[PDB]
Design a protein around this ligand. Structure first.
Ligand SMILES: *[C@@H]1O[C@H](CO)[C@@H](O[C@@H]2O[C@H](CO)[C@@H](O[C@@H]3O[C@H](CO[C@H]4O[C@H](CO[C@H]5O[C@H](CO)[C@@H](O)[C@H](O)[C@@H]5O[C@H]5O[C@H](CO)[C@@H](O)[C@H](O)[C@@H]5O)[C@@H](O)[C@H](O[C@H]5O[C@H](CO)[C@@H](O)[C@H](O)[C@@H]5O)[C@@H]4O)[C@@H](O)[C@H](O[C@H]4O[C@H](CO)[C@@H](O)[C@H](O)[C@@H]4O[C@H]4O[C@H](CO)[C@@H](O)[C@H](O)[C@@H]4O[C@H]4O[C@H](CO)[C@@H](O)[C@H](O)[C@@H]4O)[C@@H]3O)[C@H](O)[C@H]2NC(C)=O)[C@H](O)[C@H]1NC(C)=O
Ligand SMILES: *[C@@H]1O[C@H](CO)[C@@H](O[C@@H]2O[C@H](CO)[C@@H](O[C@@H]3O[C@H](CO[C@H]4O[C@H](CO[C@H]5O[C@H](CO)[C@@H](O)[C@H](O)[C@@H]5O)[C@@H](O)[C@H](O)[C@@H]4O)[C@@H](O)[C@H](O[C@H]4O[C@H](CO)[C@@H](O)[C@H](O)[C@@H]4O)[C@@H]3O)[C@H](O)[C@H]2NC(C)=O)[C@H](O)[C@H]1NC(C)=O
Ligand SMILES: *[C@@H]1O[C@H](CO)[C@@H](O)[C@H](O)[C@H]1NC(C)=O
Ligand SMILES: *[C@@H]1O[C@H](CO)[C@@H](O)[C@H](O)[C@H]1NC(C)=O
Ligand SMILES: *[C@@H]1O[C@H](CO)[C@@H](O)[C@H](O)[C@H]1NC(C)=O
Ligand SMILES: *[C@@H]1O[C@H](CO)[C@@H](O)[C@H](O)[C@H]1NC(C)=O
Ligand SMILES: *[C@@H]1O[C@H](CO)[C@@H](O)[C@H](O)[C@H]1NC(C)=O
Ligand SMILES: *[C@@H]1O[C@H](CO)[C@@H](O)[C@H](O)[C@H]1NC(C)=O
Ligand SMILES: *[C@@H]1O[C@H](CO)[C@@H](O)[C@H](O)[C@H]1NC(C)=O
Ligand SMILES: *[C@@H]1O[C@H](CO)[C@@H](O)[C@H](O)[C@H]1NC(C)=O
Ligand SMILES: *[C@@H]1O[C@H](CO)[C@@H](O)[C@H](O)[C@H]1NC(C)=O
Ligand SMILES: *[C@@H]1O[C@H](CO)[C@@H](O)[C@H](O)[C@H]1NC(C)=O
Ligand SMILES: *[C@@H]1O[C@H](CO)[C@@H](O)[C@H](O)[C@H]1NC(C)=O
Ligand SMILES: *[C@@H]1O[C@H](CO)[C@@H](O)[C@H](O)[C@H]1NC(C)=O
Ligand SMILES: *[C@@H]1O[C@H](CO)[C@@H](O)[C@H](O)[C@H]1NC(C)=O
Ligand SMILES: *[C@@H]1O[C@H](CO)[C@@H](O)[C@H](O)[C@H]1NC(C)=O
Ligand SMILES: *[C@@H]1O[C@H](CO)[C@@H](O)[C@H](O)[C@H]1NC(C)=O
Ligand SMILES: *[C@@H]1O[C@H](CO)[C@@H](O)[C@H](O)[C@H]1NC(C)=O
Lengths: 308, 230, 211, 79
């Protein structure tokens, strides 16, 4: 957490200059680095990492990965896990087809917001599950029956530089990248998206009048995790402008879309004031692909009923 | 049939305005870009600047804002202006077309593409010398053919500056023509020679005339080459 | 300028000075001294109309390869200066054409020089001047020593010699000039132009007492 | 891990001088010490402890001994 005399990189990304500590203490380190705009803020102008006045920043080791791994939660003897095999299963209530198992299936801890990736797949019809539909405060979660193929890429050929603010305290930063200055983005097949969205409108009309209208709009207000699609992709954290997906109108009756995505290295997920983590840079262009299976929607609430 | 023709004075005083004209021929000037390129002796060819179709000229920043490139639509000519010239500006000037290529590597929405320019069509090229010395006209002397395939020629003595265009019979005879390079005497003046290989039976029947033109001196000389009286 | 010497008929590869930084679009230019520059390869390997198939470029398979101009069947006409114009996204606008690469072809068959000594014209004698023109055409290699001789004694005064230059036939061509006065031209018995090439010697002689 | 202005001891062992921190933070400590040649390296000449650019150095407590003690590794019932 030093004063970062940043210059606009050749605008997001900044080329900063600062003074750190070497292996010695009195011997200071005049070094450079490269970060994103959402990593530092001003106080040319001088900058400081955003979380330096809130939560303790701590870099994660470059050896521990963040890729999700399936987990089969079990139960010891004397206890049992009951599995309801109902296809058309409303989230709660009685289940005609109940089965018993000692462990669950492959569950990936997909730390993501809004768009659920690499999740379970429903059967037959797209299942709609909400704790209370008429309550807008309750978050509605959906489970698709057809997995899509979404692709997010960071086409920046970044490089990892190793400084020594030791002893033992090694820090890996972002150096002069190669390739091209291409921002993060994702791709969505407009045909399958429009086809899947139409099936959603045909399923949403089961909890509403027959002849009605379904309107889709982007995020209102809140943090950048509530507004943008937060998820992991090879180590880096991506936050995409989902405004182009949610802007349609549906009554009763071959290209792909792209979304502008941002990358943040200093994460403060779960809103834990006091602790923080830094994402170490990842070398080479990053390319990730997933299957979107669920969504966390939310009504607007107070309005004239059954109108729109 | 696009043809670019370089035309200039060939001699300008230091700290003056240098004017070069590039003529467009078999096409309009609103389809491609145009650029100027010079080549100084002892150095490589240098890119000076280009002009787009929207009449917005762009120059190389290493000229201290001394170059001005303009283009005319009614006459189809490309002008070049250089103020406060120095003797180092002595170079062979070429005017060429500028073709705008677009290398695309990623999505076009984010501007993930860079433009590159290539010069497909070039001009013949004119020679421009920047010096405070005055001009001097050439001396055309007809080298008579020997009496004993015969050979004849024309001798262009001391002049200043380069170049000197030599043709035979106003361009009617091109076979066997060999124009040797000039020599730089200790006086600072050039002197070249030009010969043509003709059969011996043509002596006494054909009217061989060598044409010498020197643009800086504004003098075009036509000399009738005839054998000796013996 | 970087030098390069290649024999006849062998596949030569002209290397590029600066290296690439990202997605590249390379242009290779061939420049002849005194003539208009002509680009051989634009955009990695794309070849314009008129360029023979002997020239080739380097594919842009997302880095891993260096932009190189491969020339198969190098003949005498390939002797020129070659520039490498790199266009990458990192370097941005590339103004310099890189370091020049002067290609020279070796092993060419030698040719006997064609010497032709011309006496001063009659109209030049009327201008109170005289000049002996000794022309040397079609000879290889480009190493010729010119020595003027008055009668039997050589003359070092008033000798103006040009450096041998290549012409269109891939052979060298030189010219020598002997500046004299009309009295000195009409006084000596005969003048001779001695031309030495590869040990051999060809001499042309003109005299005022001969038609 | 400070700059150690070491002098050759009255050669292995060096008599060094350096600036540390006292009980206060702004109040610094001008002190001396003695170490071996394989403990510091140069950067008179100035020296630095060898492991200051590699691994985090941490002094062990002066109460825990390093003398070996016999261990009788066992196995529970069934093994
Ligand atoms: C998420 O969504 C994103 C948004 O949709 C999406 O982004 C897309 O990413 C892909 C890559 O993944 C991008 O694809 C690139 O496209 C570039 C442009 O391709 C077009 O243009 C070229 C050139 O064609 C010329 O001629 C035609 C007519 O004949 C004209 O119409 C063109 O305009 C062009 O004209 C030239 O001249 C003009 C006048 O001077 C100029 O103004 C102009 O700029 C041109 O210079 C075509 O060849 C392309 O055809 C290809 O695509 C079609 C489908 O559209 C195929 O059917 C076909 O078979 C071809 O594959 C297309 O029309 C490409 O240049 C680029 O490919 C080069 O770059 C890559 C990466 O750097 C290299 O690895 C690769 O080797 C390519 O280099 C070769 O090709 C270029 C072509 O110019 C040469 O310049 C180069 O030297 C080299 O050629 C040499 O090597 C070849 C073999 O390697 C050899 O065969 C050649 O003969 C030569 O020797 C790449 O394909 C795409 O643009 C993005 N955007 C969109 C909207 O799609 C993203 O991917 C998505 N994510 C995921 C995960 O899907
Ligand atoms: C939803 O699910 C999808 C699919 O499950 C998820 O997509 C996964 O994304 C992650 C990134 O978030 C990827 O992890 C990376 O995998 C890369 C590929 O791993 C393999 O190849 C490596 C290289 O081997 C290559 O060459 C050999 C020989 O030529 C070939 O045989 C081989 O097929 C490859 O072409 C191997 O080293 C590796 O062991 C795998 O075999 C890796 O390149 C990358 O890191 C590599 O290098 C690191 C540095 O040393 C090292 O630490 C890593 O262990 C690894 O070696 C990284 O692991 C997944 O590959 C990708 N697919 C799958 C099936 O998981 C998607 O991310 C997910 N969505 C979300 C939000 O999580
Ligand atoms: C910050 O950088 C600018 C630009 O190089 C420089 O003028 C200024 O002096 C720098 N300030 C500090 C405190 O380093
Ligand atoms: C680092 O410190 C030196 C001197 O202590 C100073 O000259 C330099 O400007 C500092 N760098 C920054 C980025 O402030
Ligand atoms: C830290 O600083 C930022 C910007 O200066 C500010 O928005 C934030 O509220 C600060 N943190 C706290 C806990 O006030
Ligand atoms: C339970 O399974 C049987 C056959 O296995 C099937 O006929 C029945 O429809 C299932 N129940 C539900 C609620 O789907
Ligand atoms: C799902 O539907 C069943 C029957 O229609 C009902 O008993 C149950 O309460 C519903 N669950 C929710 C969460 O609304
Ligand atoms: C949902 O909340 C509304 C209040 O907004 C309430 O009237 C309704 O009864 C709730 N639904 C259920 C199933 O409890
Ligand atoms: C960033 O700043 C450093 C400071 O020394 C400089 O060396 C470098 O060229 C700049 N640009 C990049 C891309 O690193
Ligand atoms: C994602 O990439 C894979 C592999 O190239 C491709 O099969 C799929 O169609 C892509 N999907 C999108 C939406 O780009
Ligand atoms: C795409 O959306 C439009 C607008 O609702 C709809 O009319 C059309 O049928 C949709 N097409 C597909 C293939 O989903
Ligand atoms: C949502 O869209 C509106 C206009 O359609 C725009 O003004 C607003 O900034 C967008 N919100 C976000 C978070 O992008
Ligand atoms: C997201 O995209 C919409 C329209 O494409 C635009 O109005 C909005 O400003 C964008 N949001 C951000 C944060 O770029
Ligand atoms: C990144 O740059 C390195 C160094 O030039 C290169 O070897 C590698 O192929 C590049 N990778 C990508 C994805 O551009
Ligand atoms: C996504 O779906 C396809 C087809 O349904 C499947 O082959 C692929 O394994 C799925 N990917 C993941 C990560 O589950
Ligand atoms: C180190 O010690 C030498 C010898 O006493 C002295 O001359 C020198 O000034 C000292 N340097 C520092 C930085 O203390
Ligand atoms: C310690 O600091 C003082 C002043 O701050 C200085 O005079 C002295 O030389 C320093 N000691 C060493 C060993 O550098
Ligand atoms: C630390 O410094 C020593 C000597 O200067 C050197 O031998 C060693 O390699 C360095 N450590 C690392 C990790 O490079």
């Amino acid at each position: 957490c030093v004063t970062l005399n940043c210059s606009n990189f050749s605008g997001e990304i900044k080329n900063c200059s600062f003074n750190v500590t070497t292996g010695l203490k009195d011997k200071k380190q005049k070094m450079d680095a490269l970060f994103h705009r959402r990593d530092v803020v001003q106080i040319n102008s001088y900058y400081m990492l955003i979380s330096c006045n809130t939560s303790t920043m701590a870099q994660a080791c470059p050896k521990i990965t963040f890729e999700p791994i399936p987990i089969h939660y079990c139960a010891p003897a004397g206890f049992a896990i009951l599995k309801c095999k109902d296809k058309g299963f409303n989230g709660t209530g009685s289940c005609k087809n109940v089965s018993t198992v000692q462990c669950t299936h492959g569950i990936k801890p997909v730390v993501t917001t809004q768009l659920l990736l690499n999740g379970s797949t429903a059967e037959e019809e797209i299942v709609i599950r909400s704790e209370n539909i008429t309550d807008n405060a309750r978050t509605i979660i959906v489970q698709l029956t057809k997995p899509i193929n979404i692709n997010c890429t960071r086409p920046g050929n970044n490089t990892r530089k190793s400084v020594r603010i030791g002893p033992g305290q090694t820090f890996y930063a972002t150096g002069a990248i190669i390739g091209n200055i291409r921002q993060a983005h994702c791709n969505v097949s407009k045909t399958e998206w429009n086809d899947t969205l139409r099936q959603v409108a045909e399923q949403l009309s089961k909890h509403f009048p027959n002849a009605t209208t379904i309107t889709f709009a982007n995020a209102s207000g809140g943090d950048l995790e509530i507004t943008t699609h937060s998820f992991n992709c090879g180590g880096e954290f991506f936050y995409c402008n989902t405004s182009k997906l949610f802007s349609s109108t549906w009554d009763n009756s071959n290209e792909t879309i792209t979304l502008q995505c941002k990358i943040k290295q200093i994460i403060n997920m779960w809103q834990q004031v006091g602790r923080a983590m830094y994402a170490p840079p990842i070398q080479g262009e990053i390319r990730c692909e997933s299957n979107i299976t669920g969504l966390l929607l939310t009504r607007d609430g107070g309005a004239n009923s059954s109108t729109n | 049939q696009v043809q670019l023709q370089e035309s200039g004075p060939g001699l300008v005083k230091p700290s003056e305005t240098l004017s070069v004209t590039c003529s467009v021929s078999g096409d309009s000037m609103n389809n491609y870009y145009w650029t100027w390129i010079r080549q100084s002796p002892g150095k490589g060819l240098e890119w000076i600047g280009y002009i787009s179709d929207r009449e917005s000229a762009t120059y190389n920043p290493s000229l201290n804002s001394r170059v001005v490139i303009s283009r005319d639509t009614s006459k189809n000519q490309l002008s070049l202006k250089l103020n406060s010239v120095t003797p180092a500006d002595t170079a062979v000037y070429y005017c060429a077309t500028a073709r705008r290529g677009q290398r695309i590597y990623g999505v076009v929405s984010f501007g993930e593409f860079f433009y590159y320019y290539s010069m497909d069509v070039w001009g013949k090229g004119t020679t421009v010398t920047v010096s405070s010395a005055s001009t001097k006209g050439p001396s055309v002397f007809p080298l008579a053919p020997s009496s004993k395939t015969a050979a004849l020629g024309c001798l262009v003595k001391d002049y200043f500056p380069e170049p000197v265009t030599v043709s035979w019979n106003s361009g009617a005879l091109t076979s066997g023509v060999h124009t040797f390079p000039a020599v730089l005497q200790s006086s600072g003046l050039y002197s070249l020679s030009s010969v043509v290989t003709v059969p011996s039976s043509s002596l006494g029947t054909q009217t061989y005339i060598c044409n010498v033109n020197h643009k800086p001196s504004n003098t075009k000389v036509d000399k009738r080459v005839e054998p000796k009286s013996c | 300028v970087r030098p390069l010497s290649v024999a006849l008929g062998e596949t030569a590869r002209i290397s590029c000075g600066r290296q690439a930084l990202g997605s590249r679009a390379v242009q290779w230019y061939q420049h002849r001294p005194g003539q208009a520059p002509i680009l051989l390869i634009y955009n990695n390997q794309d070849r314009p109309s008129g360029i023979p198939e002997r020239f080739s470029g380097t594919p842009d398979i997302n880095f891993g390869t260096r932009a190189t101009l491969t020339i198969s069947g190098v003949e005498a006409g390939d002797e020129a200066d070659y520039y490498c114009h790199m266009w990458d996204s990192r370097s941005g606008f590339s103004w310099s054409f890189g370091g020049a690469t002067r290609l020279t072809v070796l092993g060419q068959p030698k040719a006997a020089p064609s010497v032709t000594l011309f006496p001063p014209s009659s109209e030049e004698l009327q201008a109170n001047k005289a000049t002996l023109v000794c022309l040397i055409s079609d000879f290889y290699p480009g190493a010729v020593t010119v020595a003027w001789k008055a009668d039997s004694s050589p003359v070092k005064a008033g000798v103006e010699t040009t450096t041998p230059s290549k012409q269109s036939n891939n052979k060298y061509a030189a010219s020598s000039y002997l500046s004299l006065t009309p009295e000195q031209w009409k006084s000596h018995r005969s003048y001779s132009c001695q031309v030495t090439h590869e040990g051999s010697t060809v001499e042309k002689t003109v005299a005022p007492t001969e038609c």
